[PDB]
Amino acid sequence: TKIKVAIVGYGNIGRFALEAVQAAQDFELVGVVRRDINNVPEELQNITVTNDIKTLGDVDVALLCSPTRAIKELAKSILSLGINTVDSFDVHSEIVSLKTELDDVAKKHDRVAVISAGWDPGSDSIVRTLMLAMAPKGITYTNFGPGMSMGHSVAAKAIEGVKDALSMTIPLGTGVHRRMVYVELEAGANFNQVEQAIKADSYFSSDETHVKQVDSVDSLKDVGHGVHMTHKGVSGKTHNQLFEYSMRINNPALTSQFMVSAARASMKQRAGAYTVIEIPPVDFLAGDLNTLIAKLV
Amino acid sequence: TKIKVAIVGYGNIGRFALEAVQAAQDFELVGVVRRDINNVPEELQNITVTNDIKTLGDVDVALLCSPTRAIKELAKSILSLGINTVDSFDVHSEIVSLKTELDDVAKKHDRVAVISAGWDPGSDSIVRTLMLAMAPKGITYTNFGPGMSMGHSVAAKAIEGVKDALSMTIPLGTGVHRRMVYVELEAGANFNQVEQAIKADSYFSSDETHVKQVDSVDSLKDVGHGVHMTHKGVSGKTHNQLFEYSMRINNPALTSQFMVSAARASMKQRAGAYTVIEIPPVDFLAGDLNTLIAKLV
Amino acid sequence: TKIKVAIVGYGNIGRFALEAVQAAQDFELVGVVRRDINNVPEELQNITVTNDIKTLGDVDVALLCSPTRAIKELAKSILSLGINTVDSFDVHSEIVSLKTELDDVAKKHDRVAVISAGWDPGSDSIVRTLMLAMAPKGITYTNFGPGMSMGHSVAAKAIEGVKDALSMTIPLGTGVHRRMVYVELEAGANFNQVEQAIKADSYFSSDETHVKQVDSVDSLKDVGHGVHMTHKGVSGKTHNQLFEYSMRINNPALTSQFMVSAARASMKQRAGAYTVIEIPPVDFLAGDLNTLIAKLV
Amino acid sequence: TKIKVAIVGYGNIGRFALEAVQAAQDFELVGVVRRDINNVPEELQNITVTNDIKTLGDVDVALLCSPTRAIKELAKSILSLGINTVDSFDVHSEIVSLKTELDDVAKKHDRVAVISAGWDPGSDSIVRTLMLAMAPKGITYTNFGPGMSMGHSVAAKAIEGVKDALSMTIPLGTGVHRRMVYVELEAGANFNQVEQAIKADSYFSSDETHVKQVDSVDSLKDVGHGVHMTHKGVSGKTHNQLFEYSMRINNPALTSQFMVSAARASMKQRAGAYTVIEIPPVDFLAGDLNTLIAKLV
Amino acid sequence: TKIKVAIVGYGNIGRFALEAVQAAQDFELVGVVRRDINNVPEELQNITVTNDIKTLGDVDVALLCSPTRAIKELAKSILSLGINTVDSFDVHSEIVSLKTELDDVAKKHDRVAVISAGWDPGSDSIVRTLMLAMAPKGITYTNFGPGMSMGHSVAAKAIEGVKDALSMTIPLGTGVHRRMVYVELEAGANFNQVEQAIKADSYFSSDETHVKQVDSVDSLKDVGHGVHMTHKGVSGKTHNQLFEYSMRINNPALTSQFMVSAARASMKQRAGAYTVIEIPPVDFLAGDLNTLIAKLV
Amino acid sequence: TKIKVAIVGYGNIGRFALEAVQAAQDFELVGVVRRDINNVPEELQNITVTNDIKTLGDVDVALLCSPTRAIKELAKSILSLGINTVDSFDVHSEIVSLKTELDDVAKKHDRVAVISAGWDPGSDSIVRTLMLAMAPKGITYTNFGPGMSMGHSVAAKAIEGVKDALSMTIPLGTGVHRRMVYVELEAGANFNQVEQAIKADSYFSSDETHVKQVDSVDSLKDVGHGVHMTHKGVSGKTHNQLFEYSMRINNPALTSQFMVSAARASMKQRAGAYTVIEIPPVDFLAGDLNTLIAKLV
Numbered sequence A, B, C, D, E, F: 001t002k003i004k005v006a007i008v009g010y011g012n013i014g015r016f017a018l019e020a021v022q023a024a025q026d027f028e029l030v031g032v033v034r035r036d037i038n039n040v041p042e043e044l045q046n047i048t049v050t051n052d053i054k055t056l057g058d059v060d061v062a063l064l065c066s067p068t069r070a071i072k073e074l075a076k077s078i079l080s081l082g083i084n085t086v087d088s089f090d091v092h093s094e095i096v097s098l099k100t101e102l103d104d105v106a107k108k109h110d111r112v113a114v115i116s117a118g119w120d121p122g123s124d125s126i127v128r129t130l131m132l133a134m135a136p137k138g139i140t141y142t143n144f145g146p147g148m149s150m151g152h153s154v155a156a157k158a159i160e161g162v163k164d165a166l167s168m169t170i171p172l173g174t175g176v177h178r179r180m181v182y183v184e185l186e187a188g189a190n191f192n193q194v195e196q197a198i199k200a201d202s203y204f205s206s207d208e209t210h211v212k213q214v215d216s217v218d219s220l221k222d223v224g225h226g227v228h229m230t231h232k233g234v235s236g237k238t239h240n241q242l243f244e245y246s247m248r249i250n251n252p253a254l255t256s257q258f259m260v261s262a263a264r265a266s267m268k269q270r271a272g273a274y275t276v277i278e279i280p281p282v283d284f285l286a287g288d289l290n291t292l293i294a295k296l297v
């Protein structure tokens, strides 16, 4: 009666998913799937590492920790082997489309896909939904950071003269963001041009962007992140109801842990694909339903 | 395609439930049930007011706004007429017991009961559940106020020499509370005895309690309330994950609005009784599932 | 010894002025004056509604709840019938000019005009004045919101292709403001042009302005507002004295309630026109002077 | 048109009153009155120092900087010479009584007495009054410190075995206070007895009191102080209106500066005694009425 | 030119010291010393583990991660082998005494001992020292938590009927602390007696103590901690200078990392024993002195 | 055993250095050096004021309170008389260069120079250094104000049409700054040109700059200042370690007091020049080493 889980892809959240699975008494790690099976860091010395999930035998659910571009085709194929999928698919504009592509397949093979089950999308999605349950009229804002931005880091690293780069994301309220960019230059490159180029780039040209040159970019890195959500609005006909939610957290630690919670929940839903706002919150937790109700409600 | 709702009982949250229903385009108020039908305040001039729900014709769901002691027997009888119930039943220790008493009846008549659907229990219950989904190990604290305490107000009002009383509830962190009590005395009563009596009473004897004498107690009343919840804990094996949620809100405004959200949700569940941590969050909301996902997730 | 009050005009603050008058035991509502007497919303079913203040008999004071452009001529005419005026006239640059136009008339007919008696101008005006009484040298800043901006909403609504609009006002400190604008477009209009047009407009071209397109603009509305005032400065020869005042409030609720307080005060001043910084604070309050001093000083 | 001021008494606030007068271009220091004229500290090397106000010639107003017990008889006698009085008389329970004793005398000699014109009573008094003007129903709390407490310091210093003592006042919210007491003992005295004696004393027996023994008590002294006031309440019929005021200030710097502002104001009132909630706020300020209105309202 | 370090003792901070050493390019881990050499957890599979430091060959410095009672005799013996010691010796009252016992020995063998180099004592010690450098007169307070208390946990665990226990430490300001205690009872023990016993115990009888019974005590544990230090005081003759320092941190992560910084610094001091307030701050850092000055000063 | 100190230069910090020296029992003020000896304000009535340090006899150390441009040549010459120097030399980019110019001279004459010993550079420098000792990897930000900016004030005052000017420095986080500029114009100057000129100037053209015209610029001046430093980073391998330090302070009061602390420390170092991150923190303090350790560590 132990939930049998495979970690597919082993990026930044990969190592943390390993820890989150190991830490859950109700889960059993049946192995790690990845492209390069010979790259075996410290923590995978004693873990089965394959490039094909079928070699791991019986698997209830797969934590997809792959790049964003890979998640769709990868989920389709693992659902098709009669295994559940959980992913942290992070592109909001495409979530509706991903859900219905995976629903077709999930239903055919009588399995469950939980999608976009990180912290945003994920956790924060539920808190945003609760805010409209409490006060349907009014405005919600979601403020991110301070934290590293992999997307914007890549966009900076991809510009003329830039050896390495790091974009930080700074909240300025009402969903507005400042971008602090730290760069190493390539032997003999013009800072002022790199600066102007980064600010003019389409990934930065909408935002207050600041660029500083540095020696080692890696020594500035910290996987700490944060959100501050607010809702101001109306319960029935009563205005100026004020709600607020904040966390200062380790990014991959949380992303991975919520995926493990989603996986637990995936085992209890009727066949199909779900966003996390379509799952009963208590389904995410381990323990006796009645002890959990006594403790939480 | 309008959800047809009756308000049963018309206490403090009664008037606010009226506003919350009227404000929801997807609801139709089919009338108000109560013991004294001749008490008809401003807002019920034009509303059907009966002492018998059967006179209202077809009703999908009933918002129970009766005293705590009445909710169980009242829900049983309205479920038995083939109507759904939503209540803000506020006694945590008895929620598990109420759920299973109402489940029996709800299932027999093929209806839904959503129970303890205020803000605590209610909203806060979901946020407490999300906190364990994000970080299962660690401590959660729920800090209440500043706000009026009806229970402790009554306990003070019921002591020798006390004409009127008001207990405020002040948060001091880690679920610890200070109680500020304001009293009018009866012609010739000894303040020092009333003070000592209130502090010694079993409703106050565990808490830092302060007593001040005043002229009009009514002029101190404000239905404003608040919560500050915190969770410090572990995502997988990563410690010192910090989560926090705060609101400054109108108490009955919110309680009533969340009951209306629960009623909306009640129409979509399989027959039985539910706490709000057993309902998909999005079921609480009005609108097209796909627009809501696009907006929230 | 009951203060006899007429509400002249019935806009947004009109309904709230009705509530503030009704709530004050020391006031008697002698009726509501307005252009269209046949528009009779819920709360005026039982209230005298005339299109001429003379039909209400003896009236001590009039709460002018008309548009900004109407206040001057309207106050002149009601003072001229031997009635006191209170208004929330909200154009700071014109307050000195309005005071002396109303002083002439108020003195001739032996009556009192209290002007600009909202929260800003109004309440905040007194706190700004107290800050110089405590520390005459140094800087004061007044930070507004988050709150709706009717002026900027109208300026946005009045641009090509815009069906409806809503400007929010966001405080960024030191009196600097961000403007968040939400718009519905008219069937086939170009977002990018409307966006650029709004940002270029004279109401927005000085401020960090952001424009988002939305479905229902009404569902974003909340009459909640707020101020954070600061003063850093010198008491005698001692520097770095720090003062701060904040509120999160229902906008029209407060505006109307302070007008009722100003009306109470108007009954105690020598004939003429006054800003609220020229009235003894205690004159705004109901009750026995000696009980109020005992309670407050 | 220069206001001619004498400083009577030269305690702690004495030196600061000197600075506040000197700093005000609209004031002329006509001298300092005191018991011992031969005690002439640094700042009074160049200032007229008499033991009798009559030697200073024509004086518009006197800043009484004497001990609390002396203010009543001292104000009576200076009013009786046809001079205005300002004091920071700090005993709230006795303000109503002091006002009417000074009113009798002030009226007889056609002069003005402003009383209890420090920061509490004083400044804070006006902000407490404004809070009821904005929201008459609800609760106000006044939280003091962290700051030195001269009254409680003296009560500690007056106990067996105590060489020197210092009581700090710590705000714990809702007007509740913690008292931190630091003591030097006399050669061979029992700490545990002194501790228990201080906690049992009538000045401390109501409050959370902590006692630490220390070497130099003087090196812990700082004249910094602070207040955090809150009001939660009702504007008309709208609940959960939230108001807040905070300052971190030099205690005597502010007390003295507000007395100088009160003195300025005293010159503009009809004969009699006033609390500061009975004076128009703008009367406290220097400058042209129309520039001040333009700047503040 | 790599600093050769041995970890002596392997408690809670032991594993974290391993990570802090490994993470420092300027250090080389020459092995781990401990009482039970056969207990070899995950991370020590490939690390030399001895019960005698002499088996590790050449060692510049030893991180003592032993119990408090062991540190003195253990430091004496390792200094005596011509190796440097760093410890987080956490008993403030005994630091002066430990320094001079280790100074004698350190000087004899021409080595360095850095003592009490955690975060308190340690980091916080330097910030407390800086506060007197900036403002020698006035008060400093050090507020701990929320965090686990091993000392108080042990004192609770050692009482009749208590299977397991956990004491949390909650800051209430001005160095005052609340203790939240969570206990498992032994089959058939009386909660009310255990509660009373814990509150009466000498480790708790001075503090606001609260006791709750729970199922699993281990699932409440989180190694997160925090400090909030304040100083209010006088720079020269200028009062009300306000300073503040806060951190929310992983306890052992920080303790261990600061010991590694102290070890780096130990290599640069003249022979003897030191508290961390006796070491130049820059000596704690790796890198070129002139680059570090350019970056920090 | 008194430290004998001369104040050389008497600018803004000059007067405050006088107070800081006088306030330190362990110091003796042997006199003040300056260019204009006939300018003798209140506090220098009784102090020896020479234009030549040699007239003061024996001097252990000199507090250089001269302009930035003078400090180098002035320190060289006073070191050369066998006297120690302390300065608040405030140009970060040139600190490394100044240290080594003064080291040469300090060593030749067997004396000590402590340089850049204000609060930034100074105090803040030590806190920035401690942050890397606690968490070497991650980002530190230093946020200044709100406070006056002498440099930017001068740059504004030096533009066409500007009679007087004041630049305030406002922190917006992540080392980003807003500049609020207040100007008096010269009889017949165009505001819009002066505004544009100030914004375009090289001292402002990188920063969010706002310009307001005013009557008296002097009445806006307050020497209050502040810093908020943050560090987010890694202790060993543990991420999201959060550190924060804030102060609200009198600028020259603090600068001068830390120079007096540096002077005390200068008496204990081997001959040479030092930044404050190269001095043992406890060397800054007066008192018995063992009492200080007992009190702080």
Ligand SMILES: N[C@H](CCC[C@H](N)C(=O)O)C(=O)O
Pocket: A088, A090, A117, A118, A119, A120, A121, A122, A144, A145, A147, A148, A149, A169, A251, A255
């Ligand atoms: N991996 C995270 C990334 C979302 C946060 C992103 N919006 C940012 O501001 O960095 C998640 O979706 O769970």
Ligand SMILES: N[C@H](CCC[C@H](N)C(=O)O)C(=O)O
Pocket: A090, A148, A149, A150, A151, A152, A251
């Ligand atoms: N580094 C974080 C945030 C990604 C956000 C970044 N993709 C962007 O918003 O540009 C992550 O692993 O989710």
Ligand SMILES: N[C@H](CCC[C@H](N)C(=O)O)C(=O)O
Pocket: B088, B090, B118, B119, B120, B121, B122, B144, B145, B147, B149, B169, B255
């Ligand atoms: N009827 C309220 C009770 C909230 C206040 C209560 N939890 C307390 O302050 O002790 C609700 O949950 O909707």
Ligand SMILES: N[C@H](CCC[C@H](N)C(=O)O)C(=O)O
Pocket: B090, B148, B149, B150, B151, B152, B153, B251
């Ligand atoms: N006024 C709130 C809270 C009452 C909370 C009650 N449990 C108490 O503490 O007395 C209500 O109407 O539910």
Ligand SMILES: N[C@H](CCC[C@H](N)C(=O)O)C(=O)O
Pocket: C088, C089, C090, C118, C119, C120, C121, C122, C144, C145, C147, C148, C149, C169, C255
């Ligand atoms: N009508 C309001 C105006 C205040 C808010 C306005 N100053 C803003 O910028 O939002 C009043 O008289 O109270």
Ligand SMILES: N[C@H](CCC[C@H](N)C(=O)O)C(=O)O
Pocket: C148, C149, C150, C151, C152, C169, C251
């Ligand atoms: N606040 C005002 C309208 C003006 C909004 C203010 N921001 C502006 O238009 O300048 C009101 O609610 O009547």
Ligand SMILES: N[C@H](CCC[C@H](N)C(=O)O)C(=O)O
Pocket: D088, D089, D090, D118, D119, D120, D121, D122, D144, D145, D147, D148, D149, D169, D255
């Ligand atoms: N002497 C002060 C008293 C204020 C502080 C006092 N209320 C306290 O509890 O500290 C004044 O008149 O401004």
Ligand SMILES: N[C@H](CCC[C@H](N)C(=O)O)C(=O)O
Pocket: D148, D149, D150, D151, D152, D169, D251
């Ligand atoms: N604050 C007053 C003294 C009284 C202190 C107050 N806490 C008390 O004694 O009750 C002062 O500085 O003159």
Ligand SMILES: N[C@H](CCC[C@H](N)C(=O)O)C(=O)O
Pocket: E088, E090, E117, E118, E119, E120, E121, E122, E144, E145, E147, E148, E149, E169, E251, E255
């Ligand atoms: N290991 C830590 C413990 C000190 C914190 C302790 N005072 C507490 O409140 O838990 C250290 O000295 O580095």
Ligand SMILES: N[C@H](CCC[C@H](N)C(=O)O)C(=O)O
Pocket: E090, E148, E149, E150, E151, E152, E251
């Ligand atoms: N658990 C923490 C704190 C110890 C504090 C505890 N010993 C007490 O103050 O009772 C540590 O490992 O340092």
Ligand SMILES: N[C@H](CCC[C@H](N)C(=O)O)C(=O)O
Pocket: F088, F090, F118, F119, F120, F121, F122, F144, F145, F147, F149, F169, F255
């Ligand atoms: N002279 C000051 C400069 C501080 C202010 C400056 N860092 C800025 O605000 O830009 C000091 O370090 O003592």
Ligand SMILES: N[C@H](CCC[C@H](N)C(=O)O)C(=O)O
Pocket: F090, F148, F149, F150, F151, F152, F153, F251
């Ligand atoms: N008023 C401060 C700060 C000047 C900072 C200067 N760097 C500038 O930004 O202009 C001082 O006297 O040092």
